[PDB]
Amino acid sequence: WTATSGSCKGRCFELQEVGPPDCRCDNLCKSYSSCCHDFDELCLKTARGWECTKDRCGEVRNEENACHCSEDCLSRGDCCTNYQVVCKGESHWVDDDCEEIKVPECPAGFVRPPLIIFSVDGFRASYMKKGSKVMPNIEKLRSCGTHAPYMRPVYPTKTFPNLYTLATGLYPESHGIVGNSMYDPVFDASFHLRGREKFNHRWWGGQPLWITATKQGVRAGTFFWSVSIPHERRILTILQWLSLPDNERPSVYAFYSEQPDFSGHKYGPFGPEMTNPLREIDKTVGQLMDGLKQLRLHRCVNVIFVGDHGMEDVTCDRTEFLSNYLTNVDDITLVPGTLGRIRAKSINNSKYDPKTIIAALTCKKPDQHFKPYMKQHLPKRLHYANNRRIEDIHLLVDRRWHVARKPLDVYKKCFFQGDHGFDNKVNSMQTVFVGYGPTFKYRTKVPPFENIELYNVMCDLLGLKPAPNNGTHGSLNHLLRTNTFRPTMPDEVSRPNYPGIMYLQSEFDLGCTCDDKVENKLEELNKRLHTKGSTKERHLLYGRPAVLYRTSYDILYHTDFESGYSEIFLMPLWTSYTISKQAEVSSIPEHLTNCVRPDVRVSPGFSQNCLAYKNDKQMSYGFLFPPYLSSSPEAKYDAFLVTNMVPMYPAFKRVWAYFQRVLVKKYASERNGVNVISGPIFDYNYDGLRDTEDEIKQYVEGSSIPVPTHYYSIITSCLDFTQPADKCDGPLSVSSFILPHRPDNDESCNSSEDESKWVEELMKMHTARVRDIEHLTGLDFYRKTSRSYSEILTLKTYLHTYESE
Ligand SMILES: *[C@@H]1O[C@H](CO)[C@@H](O[C@@H]2O[C@H](CO)[C@@H](O[C@@H]3O[C@H](CO[C@H]4O[C@H](CO)[C@@H](O)[C@H](O[C@H]5O[C@H](CO)[C@@H](O)[C@H](O)[C@@H]5O[C@H]5O[C@H](CO)[C@@H](O)[C@H](O)[C@@H]5O)[C@@H]4O)[C@@H](O)[C@H](O[C@H]4O[C@H](CO)[C@@H](O)[C@H](O)[C@@H]4O[C@H]4O[C@H](CO)[C@@H](O)[C@H](O)[C@@H]4O)[C@@H]3O)[C@H](O)[C@H]2NC(C)=O)[C@H](O)[C@H]1NC(C)=O
Ligand SMILES: NS(=O)(=O)C1(F)CCN(C(=O)N2CC3=C(CN(C(=O)c4cc(OCC5CCOCC5)nc(C5CC5)c4)C3)C2)CC1
Ligand SMILES: [Ca+2]
Ligand SMILES: [Ca+2]
Ligand SMILES: [Cl-]
Ligand SMILES: [K+]
Ligand code: NA
Numbered sequence: 092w093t094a095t096s097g098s099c100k101g102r103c104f105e106l107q108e109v110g111p112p113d114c115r116c117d118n119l120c121k122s123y124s125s126c127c128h129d130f131d132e133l134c135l136k137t138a139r140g141w142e143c144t145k146d147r148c149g150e151v152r153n154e155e156n157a158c159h160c161s162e163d164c165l166s167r168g169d170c171c172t173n174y175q176v177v178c179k180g181e182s183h184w185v186d187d188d189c190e191e192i193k194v195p196e197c198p199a200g201f202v203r204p205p206l207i208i209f210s211v212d213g214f215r216a217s218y219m220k221k222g223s224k225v226m227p228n229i230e231k232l233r234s235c236g237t238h239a240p241y242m243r244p245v246y247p248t249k250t251f252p253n254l255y256t257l258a259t260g261l262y263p264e265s266h267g268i269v270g271n272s273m274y275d276p277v278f279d280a281s282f283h284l285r286g287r288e289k290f291n292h293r294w295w296g297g298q299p300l301w302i303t304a305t306k307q308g309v310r311a312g313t314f315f316w317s318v319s320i321p322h323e324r325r326i327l328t329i330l331q332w333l334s335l336p337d338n339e340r341p342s343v344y345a346f347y348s349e350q351p352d353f354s355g356h357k358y359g360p361f362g363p364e365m366t367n368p369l370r371e372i373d374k375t376v377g378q379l380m381d382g383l384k385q386l387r388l389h390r391c392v393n394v395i396f397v398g399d400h401g402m403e404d405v406t407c408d409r410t411e412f413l414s415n416y417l418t419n420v421d422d423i424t425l426v427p428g429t430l431g432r433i434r435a436k437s438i439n440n441s442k443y444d445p446k447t448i449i450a451a452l453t454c455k456k457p458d459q460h461f462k463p464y465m466k467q468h469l470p471k472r473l474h475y476a477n478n479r480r481i482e483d484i485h486l487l488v489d490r491r492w493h494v495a496r497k498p499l500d501v502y503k504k505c506f507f508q509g510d511h512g513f514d515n516k517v518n519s520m521q522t523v524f525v526g527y528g529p530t531f532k533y534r535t536k537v538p539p540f541e542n543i544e545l546y547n548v549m550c551d552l553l554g555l556k557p558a559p560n561n562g563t564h565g566s567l568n569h570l571l572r573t574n575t576f577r578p579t580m581p582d583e584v585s586r587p588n589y590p591g592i593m594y595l596q597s598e599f600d601l602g603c604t605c606d607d608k609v610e611n612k613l614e615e616l617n618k619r620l621h622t623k624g625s626t627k628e629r630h631l632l633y634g635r636p637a638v639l640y641r642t643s644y645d646i647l648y649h650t651d652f653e654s655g656y657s658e659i660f661l662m663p664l665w666t667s668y669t670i671s672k673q674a675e676v677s678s679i680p681e682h683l684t685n686c687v688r689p690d691v692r693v694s695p696g697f698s699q700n701c702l703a704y705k706n707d708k709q710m711s712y713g714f715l716f717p718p719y720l721s722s723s724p725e726a727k728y729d730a731f732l733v734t735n736m737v738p739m740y741p742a743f744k745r746v747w748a749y750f751q752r753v754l755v756k757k758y759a760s761e762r763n764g765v766n767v768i769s770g771p772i773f774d775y776n777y778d779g780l781r782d783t784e785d786e787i788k789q790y791v792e793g794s795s796i797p798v799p800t801h802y803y804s805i806i807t808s809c810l811d812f813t814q815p816a817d818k819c820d821g822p823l824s825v826s827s828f829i830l831p832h833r834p835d836n837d838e839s840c841n842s843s844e845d846e847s848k849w850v851e852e853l854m855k856m857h858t859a860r861v862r863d864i865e866h867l868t869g870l871d872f873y874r875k876t877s878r879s880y881s882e883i884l885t886l887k888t889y890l891h892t893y894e895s896e
């Protein structure tokens with residue numbers, strides 16, 4: 092109930108929202124049907140349009156007009172945005188040459204440069220180039236300011252998840268807005284685009300920028316605009332708020348455009364009908380910039396132009412129907428479209444089995460345009476699992492397709508030619524970023540980055556301390572002229588032990604054997620030196636990783652590799668080795684096929700054993716440093732140490748063996764050497780964070796050997812590939828992955844073929860940031876380089892995506 096008989100006289104677009112049953116006059120009142128009777132008349136004036144003409148110049152202030160061309164308008168803060176151009180001979184902001192903004196040039200009483208965030212729905216990255224002829228204002232921002240060639244959204248590449256990620260710095264799993272449609276079983280409530288449940292605060296986790304600002308005494312313009320408030324009126328309201336007195340005037344502002352998303356759904360991303368909406372967005376940008384120029388704020392304000400996601404070509408005929416796979420299609424609820432989420436239609440059905448649903452959707456058709464996953468098997472880079480609102484069964488839908496339950500859902504609801512929501516690595520889903528202003532750099536291109544990073548920068552731009560988030564603070568310091576945040580490396584928590592030879596062979600009863608009983612003072616001092624770390628500068632190029640939690644571990648040196656060996660998990664946390672361009676692949680000799688050797692530096696009680704592998708019929712084992720890459724026949728014995736062994740399902744050893752025997756050498760040839768750090772990951776509760784021992788759900792049978800959920804590798808080399816990896820003077824180049832440790836290869840539909848046809852493609856799917864691996868292992872990499880820490884942070888957030896240009 093709203094007593095709508097109050098008035099908006101003097102309160103038009105008021106900043107503090109008032110409580111029912113008092114009537115509202117803020118930019119959201121329309122959307123709650125709560126505006127006062129006179130809101131349209133007083134607050135949404137339209138008379139005479141939005142531009143001065145010559146004949147309006149000097150006019151008598153007529154308060155009915157949408158904007159004013161009268162003499163008092165500048166001092167009232169309510170001129171049309173083109174007033175000075177038409178009536179005072181000034182030029183449009185876009186026609187002025189760009190001039191570096193070295194310091195904020197602000198009017199007296201401005202405490203900090205204001206921030207204006209101009210967000211554009213569905214603005215695909217390639218629009219910057221392909222639409223450049225029709226967006227002169229946007230192109231000036233882009234070329235004069237700081238820009239990325241594109242910005243990576245979060246998954247799913249839907250609107251609300253990405254707008255709220257931009258607001259919070261959080262993955263959707265952590266902020267709670269996991270799609271445009273949702274069911275929360277604890278609430279027993281649903282969230283939709285249409286309707287009222289989406290306004291309830293309990294959906295929205297974390298701390299968005301407007302609340303961060305408020306709590307720390309920075310005033311925020313209300314970020315959200317009701318759909319019917321036209322764009323021109325949104326701009327004028329921002330400009331009016333910027334004329335408020337110092338103690339009332341906000342420091343941060345937001346404008347949101349429904350375009351070009353709205354048209355892109357109807358016409359596809361490059362439909363001829365798309366030229367106009369791009370023109371209109373640019374015209375709005377021009378109005379804002381002309382308006383800031385009138386207020387002498389155009390070399391004072393920082394302006395961000397940012398998109399939520401891109402747009403892809405998608406039509407109704409590219410729909411896969413679950414009715415062509417499942418017989419039981421009535422006992423499921425599907426959240427449909429560019430992603431799929433499945434749950435039971437009824438929680439009273441004890442006959443519902445996710446296992447059989449998944450199998451019925453797995454590699455059933457040769458061209459199948461979706462792939463089912465249990466949510467915990469999704470590529471860890473998506474960070475799309477740790478929320479009760481995300482259903483256990485997920486479908487990753489191929490770009491250009493939809494998934495639906497039954498054909499009747501498509502025709503009883505072709506309309507659309509564009510959509511989005513796909514895997515956030517897909518080129519068509521990439522979006523834009525431009526930063527223009529005194530605090531951003533001048534004419535600078537930066538590398539692509541993820542939108543999770545921007546909350547920290549927006550906090551930096553306003554002098555705010557960010558709430559805890561998924562950004563890596565410092566990783567975008569290179570966008571900014573000043574206001575940089577100076578991070579420091581986290582402190583190592585556990586220091587390693589450096590064990591020498593402490594145990595005799597006969598003290599071990601591991602059930603292992605090796606054909607190694609084969610025996611010289613020249614090469615005896617030499618192996619001694621290798622076991623004390625003589626080659627360590629070769630194999631450990633960036634310092635040892637730091638262990639950021641409390642644990643017990645040992646550094647083990649070898650001729651060809653170095654490891655940090657966990658006495659708690661009975662395996663390495665990490666294994667580091669360097670493979671030069673020249674290095675040779677050999678095979679495992681026949682006599683050493685089943686060889687596993689006790690490590691005389693590590694007690695029997697902190698060692699794995701071969702008997703457990705024999706008795707475990709499901710579980711086999713592999714090595715972290717590959718025997719294939721040993722530098723000499725004698726060095727190869729080191730690779731068979733029980734301390735280099737890790738548990739591996741036979742299905743996964745196919746993947747791993749191919750990576751180690753073929754791919755590492757190929758990368759070394761292509762990149763002119765590589766340094767590899769490999770190791771295990773344990774994430775049984777799928778939270779993206781290192782498990783403690785008491786979270787492990789699976790051990791090798793009859794033992795305390797925990798089973799990893801994943802294996803990682805980080806593969807580093809010189810960015811200037813004319814320098815070899817082990818003597819690189821400048822910036823580095825990295826690619827990494829987090830491979831799921833699975834007992835079958837059901838994920839890979841071509842897995843009955845030779846590994847050359849499917850393994851590398853699996854690895855590409857599970858590409859990862861070093862930072863993802865840091866969270867999952869509690870390690871901190873690249874501790875000792877010649878590079879600045881900010882550049883390292885940027886490197887640690889890099890994702891190798893394997894898309895073309
Ligand atoms: C991305 O960045 C984010 C933000 O930094 C990272 O997420 C943080 O990670 C922390 C570790 O998981 C986590 O810390 C825990 O928080 C508990 C208190 O949390 C409440 O308060 C905060 C602060 O205001 C608030 O933000 C939280 O909001 C969550 O929950 C509501 C829904 O109720 C949502 O609105 C919101 O979206 C958010 O949901 C998300 O997080 C929760 C977990 O909090 C998930 O379950 C959801 O799926 C969703 O993703 C909360 O309101 C605190 O109680 C925890 O302490 C327990 O564990 C410690 C271990 O040290 C132990 O010492 C304690 O005893 C305690 O255990 C007790 O509870 C157990 C569980 O019931 C029980 O089994 C025990 O026996 C004990 O009784 C802990 O400190 C922090 O909350 C989140 N923050 C956010 C915003 O999500 C995230 O990790 C990053 N991602 C990556 C990959 O790096
Ligand atoms: N077809 S589709 O794209 O699948 C579609 F169906 C999706 C729905 N839809 C709409 O019709 N809506 C959607 C929106 C409006 C007006 N809105 C805002 O006003 C707004 C804006 C903002 O900005 C947050 C800023 C944080 C700092 O960084 C910049 C972004 N946040 C938010 C919320 C996160 C807090 C909202 C969203 C109409 C039609 C299109
Ligand atoms: Ca959107
Ligand atoms: Ca975990
Ligand atoms: Cl969705
Ligand atoms: K076995
Ligand atoms: Na298969």
Ligand SMILES: [Zn+2]
Pocket residue numbers: 213250352353356511
């Ligand atoms: Zn859309």
